[PDB]
Design a protein around this ligand. Structure first.
Ligand SMILES: NC(=O)N1CCN(C(=O)c2ccco2)CC1
Ligand SMILES: [Cl-]
Ligand SMILES: [Cl-]
Length: 163
């Protein structure tokens, strides 16, 4: 566990994280994909061996000794708001289980279903609150990675409000 488990946010490429494992915003088929998933495929392509897993689940594949946790959020283009919300919460609960099982002291996480799976909505608060619901009971240092200065500020505000 981390000595004083914390949440932080950084606006940078999650493929250049400084944590003991990474969460991929994966597709269900284990394809290279685009956005975070493509950056993860270029950095850790060996982790895409048998990485296919259903929506609402996470599957860990090692790249050397570095764990890549493939977490499959729902595509809100396809899911109802209600079913999409259930599967997004479920994907984060499976991430918490895998982080615990691995025994890591830190994890790099993206906000699931906020990019091309957002169905064109702003889901910062929805996705972050499900991340907190799952990760609050873990003792790993969590570092959230984002790709927008306004998102960085809003995530940082949300973290600080609880402290
Ligand atoms: N995780 C991020 O930092 N992203 C910031 C850029 N994004 C948007 O601005 C966006 C897409 C749909 C509605 O807002 C995607 C999420
Ligand atoms: Cl970067
Ligand atoms: Cl996405």
């Amino acid at each position: 566990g981390a000595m004083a488990p914390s949440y932080r946010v950084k606006r940078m490429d999650i493929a250049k994280n400084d944590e003991e494992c990474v969460v991929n915003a994966a597709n269900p088929r284990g394809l290279p994909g685009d956005g975070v998933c493509k950056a993860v495929y270029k950095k850790w392509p060996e982790s895409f061996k048998n990485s296919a897993t259903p929506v609402g689940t996470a599957k860990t594949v090692m790249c050397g000794t570095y764990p890549v946790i493939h977490a499959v959020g729902p595509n809100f283009s396809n899911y109802t708001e209600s079913e999409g919300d259930r599967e997004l919460a479920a994907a984060y609960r499976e991430v918490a289980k895998e982080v615990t099982r691995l025994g890591v002291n830190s994890v790099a996480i993206p906000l699931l279903s906020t990019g091309v799976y957002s169905g064109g909505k702003d889901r910062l608060t929805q996705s972050l609150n499900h991340l907190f619901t799952a990760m609050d009971s873990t003792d790993a240092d969590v570092v959230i990675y984002c790709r927008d200065k306004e998102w960085e500020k809003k995530i940082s505000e949300a973290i600080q409000m609880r402290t």
